[PDB]
Amino acid sequence: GLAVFLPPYPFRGLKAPYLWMFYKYLHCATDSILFITGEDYLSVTDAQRARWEFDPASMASLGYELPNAQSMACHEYLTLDNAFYETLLSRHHHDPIKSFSAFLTERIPDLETELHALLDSKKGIIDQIDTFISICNCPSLEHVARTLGKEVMHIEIGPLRAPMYRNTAYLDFAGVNGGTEASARYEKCQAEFDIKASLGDLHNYFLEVLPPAEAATHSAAGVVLQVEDCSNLIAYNHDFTNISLLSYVRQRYEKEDILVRAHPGSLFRLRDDVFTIDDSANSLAFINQCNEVFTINSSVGLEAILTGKKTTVLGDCSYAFINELAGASATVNAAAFYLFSYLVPFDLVFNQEYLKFRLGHPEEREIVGKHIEFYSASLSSLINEAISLE
Amino acid sequence: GLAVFLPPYPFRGLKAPYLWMFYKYLHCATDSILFITGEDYLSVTDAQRARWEFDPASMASLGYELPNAQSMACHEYLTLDNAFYETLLSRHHHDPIKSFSAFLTERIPDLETELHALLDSKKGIIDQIDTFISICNCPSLEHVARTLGKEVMHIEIGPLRAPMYRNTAYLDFAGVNGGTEASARYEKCQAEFDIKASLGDLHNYFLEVLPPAEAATHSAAGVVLQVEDCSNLIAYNHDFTNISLLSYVRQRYEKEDILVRAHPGSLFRLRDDVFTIDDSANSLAFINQCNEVFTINSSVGLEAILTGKKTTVLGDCSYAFINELAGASATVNAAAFYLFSYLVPFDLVFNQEYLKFRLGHPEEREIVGKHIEFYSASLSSLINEAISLE
Ligand SMILES: CC(=O)N[C@@H]1[C@@H](O[C@@H]2O[C@@H](C)[C@H](O)[C@@H](O)[C@H]2O)[C@H](O)[C@@H](CO)O[C@H]1O
Ligand SMILES: CC(=O)N[C@@H]1[C@@H](O[C@@H]2O[C@@H](C)[C@H](O)[C@@H](O)[C@H]2O)[C@H](O)[C@@H](CO)O[C@H]1O
Ligand SMILES: Nc1ccn([C@@H]2O[C@H](COP(=O)(O)O)[C@@H](O)[C@H]2O)c(=O)n1
Ligand SMILES: Nc1ccn([C@@H]2O[C@H](COP(=O)(O)O)[C@@H](O)[C@H]2O)c(=O)n1
Ligand code: NA
Ligand code: NA
Ligand code: NA
Ligand code: NA
């Protein structure tokens, strides 16, 4: 059985922050699941149905329906208490973002004590768990898992998303976004890797539309801004922020040569009278008119690499190791492995059968084969003609 | 003679960051001044005259004219080298904001070595200095000053500004914005302090217009946002940022009860579809329609206190000690002392005669007397009827 960990702590000021993954697992569930979460994940259906998770375009794009009493009663629930969250805040001077960073990057002994108490609250629970699944890093939970002998798959929506791309997801046994294992997996297959496809072929395989035509007018430098309170910008950012990213670029380019694109999910937008503000319908059309791209650790960085743009990546993230290679050919090879073996087809990370497949730690070849099979209806060879056939 | 320190390091991506204070001291100069700055402070008049310092409304409000060759040739110049700035950046992983924070809060031995070398480059220079003046904290410079036996007045525009208020300035021997001495000065006059005026009287004395009428409609909580790369938000902020300030408030109020006002000087503005976004012509009209106010350490916080609003002050700043008092009466007394003795009438901090007056460390009574005299055309008594007469 899966034990899916969906923390209810509203670090960013919003109840049931990870509600979409709750609804996705419930909808795809083929077995009884053990949810470790908050009661907020169960009520909210009662007066804020103006949230994006309830939007029909959200549901169609992510492929889930809303649950009912029957759908939810099929599973088991362990609910965390809010009193620990209140205590956590005061231990970080009442800063919820700081507390969020601690949650992501430090063991919290009181939380380990509660998780142990909950897992033990009913006998047989622990022995039925085949793996934990967590939507974010959590050293409290990971310490608990070591003690009980259980693995932890970290899982999230990936850097390529619909409608521009095939939906992808992350699945990492060590950590998602921060502390990933993508680099280590690649360096063991670097020996026998020679992708014959070009970078554009790789990009086109995952694009649902054709890449944009030439922009005609370009800007020397593009700046990707991100969501200010995403785990990427508060814990994995090497201390960089949007404004210091801007400053970093201003050490190199005049104002006239900087094109800035705010994140559509951010609470803030750029004012007009300072920089040239991108207005493209999507980040690829913005990338298309820049000579080089600057980011902390936004998904758009991978788009920039996949289109052959010089990219600066200031924070920690899953694809950074690709940007640290010196050549276009090493880049293609690393990129192919990242797209076809590290990234998972979105629906599969919610497929209990596929999760048990990965819990057996199969060879990379087997991993790439399963993904190519889903995308379609030697590891270099599989990819090589997978691109050609497509 | 004054030795005015105006660092040229473009931490925020803009040459001659402190150019207005250069122009203000040059314009008010009644003696030869020793400027320690960059050559950028001397050229920029040559293609970015679209900066606010060149705006006629800027000049009229701050009371300076542009300098010419004659005006500038009256003084002496020691220019810092850029190679140290390049080295400083790489020592902070190329993050200019982080380097800025280090500059404000750490000794930098290479900079001390350069300042010493410059001050010694011409004999007689050091012996002619009566005090350093610095527009920001700088432990490098302060260490140098200790060695040579010189004081350091930290000086800046204050929390009350034209056109809403009489212009004020800061003058602090220990530190401006961070590490101030306003609290310590107050606690030595707390004994003999009984201001009979009300809080509204104090506020009205500094207002150039009458306070706004009642708003009719209110919001439970107002959120003051600040400029992201101001020294207040990067070094004196106790790690809080705009987005975590928002999160702090969202732990207490529903979205429907939050009114947010972005800073007019910030590069970012709020999008409309999330919170109610303030549109007031000034921060007092925004304050007027809030039941309580939340800030990191914005000047607007002092406005909120002066109007009797419950205020939360999360960062370090000059007026925090006022907010830490429990009562309205202790609050008035502390507020009166802050407005009349800690804050300086703006023009005076550029008046060499007045600076020599403060370098003699006179009694608080003498300080309050000089300021009230300027504003007009026992320490409790002086203030009491200064408010009444006005
Ligand atoms: C599916 C998707 O992209 N949703 C966006 C939200 O991001 C997702 O949900 C949050 C709760 C997690 O922290 C994210 O890592 C991600 O899984 C995003 O929060 C909002 C706006 O910021 O936009 C949605 O479209
Ligand atoms: C006089 C004034 O208020 N100017 C504003 C600028 O602030 C001043 O100049 C900068 C360089 C210092 O860092 C500040 O502490 C302050 O002295 C401000 O930078 C800009 C926009 O941010 O707006 C001016 O009006
Ligand atoms: N400045 C930005 C950042 C992200 N984005 C979009 O948001 C999605 C996720 O990007 P982050 O990883 O930066 O949150 C990207 O794939 C892209 O579609 C954008 O359109 N503009
Ligand atoms: N959110 C904000 C912050 C500041 N301000 C204005 O900017 C001036 C300086 O405020 P900071 O100290 O926050 O930079 C204030 O006196 C006020 O006039 C504003 O109008 N809205
Ligand atoms: Na395609
Ligand atoms: Na590279
Ligand atoms: Na008045
Ligand atoms: Na108080």
Q: What is the DSSP string of A221-251?
A: EEEE---TTSHHHHTSSTT--HHHHHHHHHT
A55 touches chain B (CB under 8 A): no
| Cα B229 off chain centre by | 14
Q: d(Cα A304, Cα B3) in Å, to the nearest integer?
A: 49
B13 contacts on A by Cβ (under 8 Å): 246-247, 249-251
DSSP state of A278: P
Instruction: Give start-end residues of each CATH 3.40.50 domain in chain B.
Output: 199-340
State how far residue B314 is from chain A, nearest Cα, in angstroms.
Answer: 9
State which of A40, A54, A230, A236 you would mutate to test the pocket of ligand 1, scoring each by most atoms of that ligand within 8 A of its C-beta. A230
State the Cα–Cα distance between residues A364 and B19, nearest whole angstrom: 59
* For the CA of B293, the nearest ligand: 4
Pairing type for strands B2-5 and B34-37 reads: parallel
Indicate the class that CATH gives domain A199-340.
alpha beta
> Residues A271, B263: contact at Cβ < 8 Å?
no
Q: Tell me how far apart the alpha carbons of residues B338 and B236 are, in angstroms, rounded to a whole number.
A: 19
Helix H or strand E segment including B87: helix B83-91
Q: How far apart are CA B197 and CA A322, in angstroms?
A: 67
Which-ligand-closest: CA of A327?
A: 6
The answer to whether the CB of A283 is under 6 A from ligand 3 is: yes
Report residue B150 as tokens: 């010189």
Count of all residues that appear for chain A in the document: 390
Give the one of B96, B239, B251 whose C-beta lies nearest to A98's C-beta. B239
Token pair belonging to A208: 């649902």
Closest protein CA for atom 18 of ligand 1 = A265
- Which of A96, A243, A269 lies at the smallest CB-CB distance from B244? A96
- Residues A298 and A306: their CA atoms lie apart, in Å, by 14
Is the CB of A269 less than 8 angstroms away from the CB of B268? yes
Residue B200 makes CB contacts below 8 A (sequence gap 6+) with B211, B307, B308
Residues of B in contact with A242 (CB under 8 A): 228
Nearest alpha carbon to residue B243 among B228, B257, B253, B265: B228
- Tell whether A241 lies on the interface with B, counting CB pairs under 8 A: yes
φ, ψ dihedrals at B93, nearest 5°: 55, 30
Query: What distance in angstroms lies between residue B382's CA and the mean position of ligand 6's atoms?
Result: 69
Phi and psi at B169, nearest 5°, equal -140, 160
The sheet that has A131-134: what strands, in order across it? A76-79, A34-37, A2-5, A131-134, A152-157, A168-172, A344-345
Ligand 1 atom with least separation from CA of A62: 1
* Listed residue (A173, A165, A186) closest to A345, CA to CA: A165
- Please list, in sequence order, all residues whose beta carbon lies within 8 angstroms of the beta carbon of residue A231, skipping any fewer than 6 positions away: A100, A104, A136, A137, A177, A178
Beta carbons of B269 and A274 less than 8 Å apart: no
In whole angstroms, give the CA distance from residue A35 to residue A42: 11
- Please name which of B40, B9, B49, B10 lies closest in space to residue B22, comparing C-alpha atoms: B40
Phi, psi of B222 (to 5 degrees): -100, 145
Tokens of B269: 């503005």
Q: How many whole angstroms separate alpha carbon A221 and alpha carbon A260?
A: 9
| Cβ within 8 Å, pair B12-A247 | yes
**What distance in Å separates the CA atoms of residue B35 and residue B134, rounded to the nearest whole number?**
10
Q: Is A193 in a helix, a strand, or coil?
A: coil
Residue type present at position B13: G
The CA-CA-CA angle for residues A67, A172, A245, to 5°, reads 100
Q: What is the dihedral of CA B331, B333, B338, B344, to 10 degrees?
A: 150
- The rounded distance, in Å, linking the Cα atoms of A195 and A207 is 19
Alpha-carbon distance B170 to B157, whole Å? 6
Question: Is B9's Cβ below 8 Å from some Cβ in A?
Answer: no
User: Are the CB atoms for A108 and A140 separated by under 8 Å?
Assistant: yes
3-state secondary structure of B207: strand
Ion ligand 5 neighbours (CB, 5 A) are A 204, 207
Sign of the Cα torsion B103, B104, B107, B111 reads positive
Inter-chain touch B269–A268, beta carbons under 8 Å: yes
Residue written as tokens 């048990």?
A: A356
B211 preceded by a cis bond (ω within 30 of 0): no
Q: How many Cβ atoms are within 10 Å of B237's Cβ, its own excluded?
A: 23
Structure-determination technique: X-ray
Q: How far is the CA of A202 from the centre of ligand 5 (A)?
A: 9
Token pair of A284, please? 């690829």
Enclosing H/E stretch for A120: none
Q: Which of A81, A79, A102, A78 is nearest to A90 (CA)?
A: A102
CA distance B326 to B303: 18
B310 touches chain A (CB under 8 A): no
Q: Can you tell me which residue has the tokens 């995308």?
A: A375
DSSP symbol at A178 = S
The reply to whether omega before B264 is within 30° of 0 (cis) is no
Site from B86, B234, B244 to mutate, A interface, most A CB atoms within 10 angstroms:
B244
The pair of structure tokens assigned to B142 is 């302060």
Beta bridge partners, B76, equal B34
Resolution of this model in Å is 2.4
Conformation bin of residue B124: beta by default, left when phi > 0, alpha when psi is -120 to 50: left
Q: How far apart are CA B233 and CA B226, in angstroms?
A: 7
**Which pairs from A121-128 meet CB under 8 Å and 24+ separation?**
A121/A78, A125/A34, A125/A76, A125/A78, A128/A1, A128/A34
